[PDB]
């Protein structure tokens, strides 16, 4: 098996910058006078898309900003000038030996300028309140960087081990992120309290912001 | 134009069998080698199988040999993959791919997910996420849908029948302790249309034949 090791694993660059991803094969990918190295682009919820094949040939339909080179055991993929839509995981693929193989992939994040999250909070809806379970959702919409912090507070009581987070994939239009924090409490706990607060700390906020609501 | 429709994915018990198919279209199917590639949730891409133009030859890595069978029906322009003795390690997103003479897979299927688990199918519950009146981001109101407790993946959440795509965010689903998934879908709208217009979120969980149309409003 020909092992393909891509480098770097993660890349964070601002639009307009030049990106270079490398791939090193354990054994030559060269045969019959050609390097059988392909490069694929995979975006969230989509299939890998062919960018370059046979090492240096641009796939028709693909913007000229993409190009590849190399031969033998060393290959390189280049994006001369990043656009916010280039956010994706890139894979090098080998078509020369027994079992075809893909590199481990390089995650490319598009560096965007600091963007502060717009905080929202949602109390558990009447329906779910009948199910004997309460879910409080705090929304962090359109921010960057991705690193953020969300503490829950129930009547000034700092929660712990009872909330789950889910962050969206970077937007391909404006490169921001959105995050969701859900607090799951029993119907009893929620009713025996009143102040539900969501404190968010982020680089775009000069001071942590808190969003809250009183039940009912 | 050239397109590959995949189907047959879903939930299946460990040790079970499942068949994926890929209906080719827009090109001389019998003139190409076909591939099945898979992606374990969150991991990378792995080759699963290859078959020649007329089905004469086929290849599989040792981890699939004897368990999976790739085949094709050139008269129906369809590619198949019969799986057997499935295990958790086999759960993943499966793709079909066409292979050019220049050694490059240029067209791929959208993909079909295969979850290998003994756990049972559970339809999701949809609770609204209306905008509180105390919440006022100036001219924008955020409201969404909460799809809780369902299995397996995935779930499809749209708004006003796909008519409302702008500004929508459907977060990736998280697994809860119980053993079920949960995800939220929110959309930001101009607070001047909150009462003005009607907002409905269309949820579809194909593995349980559930299609809910919960309506939200503060």
Q: Do B47 and A99 touch (CB under 8 A)?
A: yes
Q: Which of A38, A48, A102 comes nearest B108 by C-beta?
A: A48
Q: In whole angstroms, what is the distance from residue A46 CA to residue A72 CA?
A: 30
Tell whether A166 is within 8 A of chain B (Cβ): yes
* Helix H or strand E encompassing A187: helix A187-191
B13 and B106 co-located in one domain: yes
Reported structure resolution in angstroms: 2.5
- B66 and B149 together in one domain: no
Residue finishing a domain among B118, B135, B167? B118
> Do B196 and B185 form a contact (C-beta atoms < 8 A)?
no
CATH architecture of A1-112: Sandwich (2.60)
Residues of chain A with CATH 2.60.40.10: 1-112, 113-216
B152 shares a domain with B172:
yes
- One domain, residues B176 and B89: no
Range of the domain at B94: 1-118
Co-location of B82 and B5 in the same domain: yes
Neighbours of B11 (CB within 10 A): 21
DSSP code string of A115-155:
B--EEEEEPPPHHHHHTTEEEEEEEEEEEBSS--EEEEEET
Nearest in space to A176 (alpha carbons), one of A118, A121, A137: A118
Q: Which of B118, B153, B184 finishes a domain?
A: B118
What technique determined this structure? X-ray
Is B129 in Cβ contact with A59 (below 8 Å)? no
First-to-final CA distance of chain A: 63
Residues of chain A with Cβ-Cβ distance to B125 below 8 Å are 128, 131
- As to burial, measured by CB atoms within 10 angstroms (0-12 exposed, 13-18 middle, 19+ buried), residue B90 is buried
CATH of the domain at B95: 2.60.40.10
Sorted by sequence, the CB contacts under 8 Å of residue B160 that are 6+ apart come out as B198, B199, B200, B202
According to DSSP, residue A156 is labeled: T
Q: How many residues does chain A have?
A: 216
Q: Would you tell me which residues 197-216 of chain A have a C-beta closer than 8 angstroms to some C-beta of chain B? A: 211, 213
3-class state of residue A90 by DSSP: strand
- Do B127 and B70 belong together in one domain? no
Total domain count for chain B?
2
What does CATH list as the number for A113-216?
A: 2.60.40.10
- Nearest CB to A50; choose among B46, B104, B146: B104
Whether B119 contacts B151, CB under 8 Å: yes
Same structural domain, B102 and B146: no
A96 and A2 Cβ atoms separated by less than 8 Å: yes
A182–B104 C-beta distance less than 8 A:
no
d(CA A8, CA A72): 19
Instruction: Using a CB–CB cutoff of 8 Å, tell me whether A172 touches chain B.
Output: no
**Same domain, yes or no, for B106 and B158?**
no
């Amino acid at each position: 098996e020909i092992v393909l090791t891509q480098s770097p694993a993660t890349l964070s660059l601002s639009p307009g910058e030049r990106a270079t991803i490398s791939c090193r094969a354990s054994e030559s990918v060269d045969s019959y006078g050609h390097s059988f190295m392909q490069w694929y682009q995979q975006k969230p919820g989509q299939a890998p898309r062919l960018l370059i094949y046979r090492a240096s040939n641009l796939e028709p339909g693909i913007p000229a900003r993409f190009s590849g080179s190399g031969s033998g055991t060393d290959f390189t993929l280049t994006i001369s000038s990043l656009e916010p839509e280039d956010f994706a995981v890139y894979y090098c693929q080998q078509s020369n030996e027994a079992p075809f193989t893909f590199g481990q992939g390089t995650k490319v994040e598009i560096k965007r300028t600091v963007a502060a999250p717009s905080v929202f909070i949602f109390p558990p809806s009447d329906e779910q309140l009948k199910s004997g379970t309460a879910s409080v959702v705090c929304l962090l919409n359109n921010f960057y960087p991705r690193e953020a912090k969300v503490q829950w507070k129930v009547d000034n009581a700092l929660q712990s081990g009872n909330s789950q987070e889910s962050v969206t994939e970077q937007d391909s239009k404006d490169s921001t992120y959105s995050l969701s924090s859900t607090l799951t409490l029993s119907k009893a706990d929620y009713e025996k309290h009143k102040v539900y607060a969501c404190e968010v700390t982020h680089q775009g906020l000069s001071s942590p912001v808190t969003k809250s609501f009183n039940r009912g | 134009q050239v397109q590959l429709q995949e189907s047959g994915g879903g939930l299946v018990q460990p040790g079970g069998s499942l068949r994926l198919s890929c209906a080719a279209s827009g090109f001389t199917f019998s003139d190409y080698y076909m591939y099945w590639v898979r992606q374990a949730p969150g991991k990378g891409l792995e080759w699963v199988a290859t078959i020649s133009d007329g089905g004469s030859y086929t290849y599989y890595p040792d981890s699939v040999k004897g368990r999976f069978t790739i085949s094709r029906d050139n008269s129906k322009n369809t590619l198949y993959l019969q799986m057997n003795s499935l295990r958790a390690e086999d759960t993943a997103m499966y793709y079909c791919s066409r292979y050019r003479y220049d050694d490059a897979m240029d067209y791929w299927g959208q993909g079909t997910l295969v979850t290998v688990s003994s756990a049972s199918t559970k339809g999701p519950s949809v609770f609204p996420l209306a905008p509180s009146s105390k919440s006022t981001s100036g001219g924008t109101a955020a409201l969404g849908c909460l799809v809780k407790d369902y299995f397996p993946e995935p779930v499809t959440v749209s708004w006003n029948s796909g008519a409302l795509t702008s500004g929508v965010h459907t977060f990736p689903a998280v697994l809860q302790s119980s053993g079920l998934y949960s995800l939220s879908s929110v959309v930001t709208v101009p607070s001047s249309s909150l009462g003005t217009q009607t907002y409905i979120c269309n949820v579809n969980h194909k593995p349980s034949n559930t299609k809910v149309d919960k309506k939200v409003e503060p």
